[PDB]
Amino acid sequence: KFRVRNRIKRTGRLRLSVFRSLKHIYAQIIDDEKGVTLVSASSLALKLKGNKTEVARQVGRALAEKALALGIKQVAFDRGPYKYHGRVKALAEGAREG
Amino acid sequence: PLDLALKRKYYEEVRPELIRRFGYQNVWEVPRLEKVVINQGLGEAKEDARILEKAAQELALITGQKPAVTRAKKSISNFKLRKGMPIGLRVTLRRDRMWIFLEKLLNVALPRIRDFRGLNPNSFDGRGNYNLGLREQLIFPEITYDMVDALRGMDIAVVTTAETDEEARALLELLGFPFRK
Amino acid sequence: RMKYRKQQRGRLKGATKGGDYVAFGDFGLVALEPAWITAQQIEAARVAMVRHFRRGGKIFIRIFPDKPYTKKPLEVRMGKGKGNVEGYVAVVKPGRVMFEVAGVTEEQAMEALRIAGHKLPIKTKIVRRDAYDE
Amino acid sequence: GIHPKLVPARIICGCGNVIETYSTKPEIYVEVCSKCHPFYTGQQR
Amino acid sequence: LLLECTECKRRNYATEKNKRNTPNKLELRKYCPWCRKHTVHREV
Amino acid sequence: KKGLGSTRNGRDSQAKRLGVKRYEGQVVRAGNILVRQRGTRFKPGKNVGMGRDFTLFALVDGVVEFQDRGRLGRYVHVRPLA
RNA sequence: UCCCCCGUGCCCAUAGCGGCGUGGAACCACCCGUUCCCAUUCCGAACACGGAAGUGAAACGCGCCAGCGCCGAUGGUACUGGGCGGGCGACCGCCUGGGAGAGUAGGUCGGUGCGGGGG
RNA sequence: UCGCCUCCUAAAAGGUAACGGAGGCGCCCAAAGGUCCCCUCAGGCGGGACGGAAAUCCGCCGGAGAGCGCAAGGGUAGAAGGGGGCCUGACUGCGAGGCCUGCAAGCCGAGCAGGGGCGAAAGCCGGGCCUAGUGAACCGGUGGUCCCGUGUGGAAGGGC
RNA sequence: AGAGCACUGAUAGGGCUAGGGGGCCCACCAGCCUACCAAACCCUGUCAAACUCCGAAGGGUCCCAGGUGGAGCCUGGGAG
Ligand SMILES: [Mg+2]
Ligand SMILES: [Mg+2]
Ligand SMILES: [Mg+2]
Ligand SMILES: [Mg+2]
Ligand SMILES: [Mg+2]
Ligand SMILES: [Mg+2]
Ligand SMILES: [Mg+2]
Ligand SMILES: [Mg+2]
Ligand SMILES: [Mg+2]
């Protein structure tokens, strides 16, 4: 069902496991080995509005702001069951851009 | 588009009379209609070439959408099914597409059936999957004659949100599913 | 049967698990020492029981020849004996309940098992029953 | 599209009429009105 | 069925095999050489 | 005495040295191999890996260990560090 | 520090199957529509976008049962190192270490770490 | 029968013999190769125009009993199994460290540079799920190569 | 080894039951009983080198410690 959870676990660490629900989008940056989460970016758990696609694009810009003061740079995406298309792109495409 | 006859006659009549008879707590317990599937028990025209594909350009007249061919795996040599890549015409239809055919099922494609007593009252599998069999095909009004060749029957299944064995049997009784009692 | 061909031997090691207890039956037969009981003393022991009492009883054979015999015919040494020239045998170790029957008293059944007990190369001891069921 | 759409009009029931339509061919007459009551409908023998 | 491929506007070879009867009568693919860098290779 | 000739059952194949090479708690270097095997009986874990023939070889210098993921198989890892 | 929900990770069936009740404030799912990105070897079934008419029925999480399933001792036994003995024979016995399998009582409708939201 | 592959005999590291018990190979795949993505079986029950114990369909049950080219074994749906797209990494130059082992061999392999494929990226790609599908050396053909080339310059032959 | 039947196959008895055997409905072509042969499944009790849901004593390998033994290691000469 999931695979790519394992696919990344081969390479490095720093799981960025994104959860997308019908009105909600939560994006962490979670590290294994130690098995502990870090930057817990969200929107329906933050306070951002509700237009979905163009809303993921900003939570994506949050981790950047939030993490680059924590010793972070290393991308390590974690697409869920989803397909790198809409909200997951916008969520992503702001990341390194942030 | 989004409004049609039995479309209205579904919500605007069929659901209520189903609940005063039986008795439902929630709303998503009524037997609404989820999917209609069509299966072509072919195998014949598999042989040659001039005919086998034409079992499709018509089954877009009954649902607007083109159909689908499918095949098999096991190695049955009892008739030229080597290894497995045969014939299997099927189609599935939802929303309005699943409605017009229904609106055209119990209304125009009915009277011209040999010994038309109604529909089978015994062919029940408990879970809302009543089944029938369509020998002839001219009963579909679009299926005329002026552009046909021969017999191309098929059988169609029906899927419900029903629970009991008697349930959908009642749901049928108000959409247009006569039986023999 | 169906199985497949032929099989090695098996040194009857610990006079043990080849063993049971009088289940569905009144009295039964036991093994004092091991052997390879064949599909020809069984029937020979079987019919010997029936013939003691015509019209009566039920004999419960509890061993089965699932083993191949192998003999060569007067030749030298090559390949493995197809054999089976006597057929099949049943691995028998002591303690095993060979036969057991039901349907009569004992004076009519202390002998039917005494007889067939003579159709065996191994010493036997008739089992009364002893409700030691496990 | 990639297939003909759903042009509605009238399916000329034989009795009187039904609108309904879509399918494909619009002005389709059909002989037996079929629902419309032509037999097995309210019982009639 | 044995086979080997040479590159375009310069003869030099590499190694593989074709199969003929399986309709594959032409064979041309890209490859990496040790002279020049990357180009179209043929056959013969 | 002159008899028959032959059967069909003397063919065999020659050995493949199927085994675990280094064991748990053995210092191993870089590149070493740990499991020659048929299939994925022991699976590659931390700092291990396999090509082609299911051959568990240490990516980096350290100590070898076994943990049993019951369900998920058996896993040979590498403790680099020291 | 604790309880619920959500994402997730570990220990790997004392988590599973089946049945029974609950949960809808937020949570998530069902659900409305396919105009645009995307898509079905037919189909918005699924992937996807836009979203608030309806609901917790489904699916899902939480509590109870023990029917199946699983876990399962102690005890004793088979077996076996190692030393030794008996029978020509198939085999058996003694001592010192190790100690099963299955069967019994019993247990089990999971445990736990991180983050986030709501209590 | 002679070489190679799978199980047992192989007595729980490897290995082990017998004209012991049972079976295979001397092929193959431009897709059966790699990258990214979608999907997950056999069987059973019950309904279904053909056919009919067994044809494509549908609801439920269904954790692997199907499939993975061919013998067998290990493995495996948390894919190596079934579809689609883009590709040629069945690259070149190297190659630490190691399994097996008398020699010769055989086998796995991270790491770098040149250049490229796929993917948004992490990353993967030095043939195929694997274990069989092969032949020292001598001699000779074909294509390149800053080479040697007999007093010298070409040439002839040789060499890589 | 052992033991077990959860996979592979083998088996005695009983049970319920797909199929067929006797007997009527004597034929729409189905049906009921059955000291009959019989698989699916269950209990009773089992068989196995190429069966294992389990599983030893022992066996091999690395670390630590005792261990100085004609131990072990390396190079070379010679053999059998
Ligand atoms: Mg080209
Ligand atoms: Mg060149
Ligand atoms: Mg190139
Ligand atoms: Mg290996
Ligand atoms: Mg409070
Ligand atoms: Mg492949
Ligand atoms: Mg397969
Ligand atoms: Mg044994
Ligand atoms: Mg020491």
Q: Tokens standing for E1?
A: 């069925």
For residue E11, the one-letter residue type is R
Resolution in A: 3.2
Q: Which nucleotide is nearest to C24 (CA to C1')?
A: I44
Q: Which of C59, C49, C64, C63 is nearest to C103 (CA)?
A: C59
Q: Is F76 exposed, middle or buried (0-12, 13-18, 19+ CB in 10 A)?
A: buried
CA atoms in the 13 A half-sphere facing the CB of F14: 0
CA end-to-end span of chain E: 13
Q: F11 to chain C nearest CA, in Å?
A: 13
Between chains, do D34 and B108 touch, taking CB under 8 Å as contact?
Answer: yes
Residue B173: how many CB atoms within 10 A of its CB?
Answer: 15
Question: What is the SS3 assignment for chain A?
Answer: CCCHHHHHHHCCCCEEEEEECCCCEEEEEEECCCCEEEEEECCCCCCCCCCCHHHHHHHHHHHHHHHCCCCCCCCCEECCCCCCCCHHHHHHHCCCCC
CA atoms in the 13 A half-sphere facing the CB of A61: 9
**Residues of B whose CB is below 8 A from D32:** 111-112
Residues in a beta bridge with E16: E3
Q: How far is residue E3's CA from residue C12's CA, in Å, rounded to a whole number? A: 63
Nucleotides of I under 7 A from a protein CB: 1-4, 9-13, 44-50, 60-63
Is-contact B92 B37, C-beta < 8 A?
Answer: yes
Is-contact C124 C92, C-beta < 8 A?
Answer: no
Q: Which of B7, B5, B3, B18 is nearest to B174 (CA)?
A: B18
**Residues of F whose CB is below 8 A from C76:** 1, 3
Q: Tokens standing for F57?
A: 């070889």
Q: How far is residue C105's CA from residue C57's CA, in Å, rounded to a whole number? A: 10
Q: Which of A25, A39, A49, A37 is nearest to A69 (CA)?
A: A39
| Helix %, strand %, coil % of chain C (to 5) | 15, 20, 65
When computed from its CA atoms, the radius of gyration of chain F, rounded to whole angstroms, is: 19
Q: Looking at the partner chain, which of B61, B111, B178 has a beta carbon nearest the beta carbon of D38?
A: B111
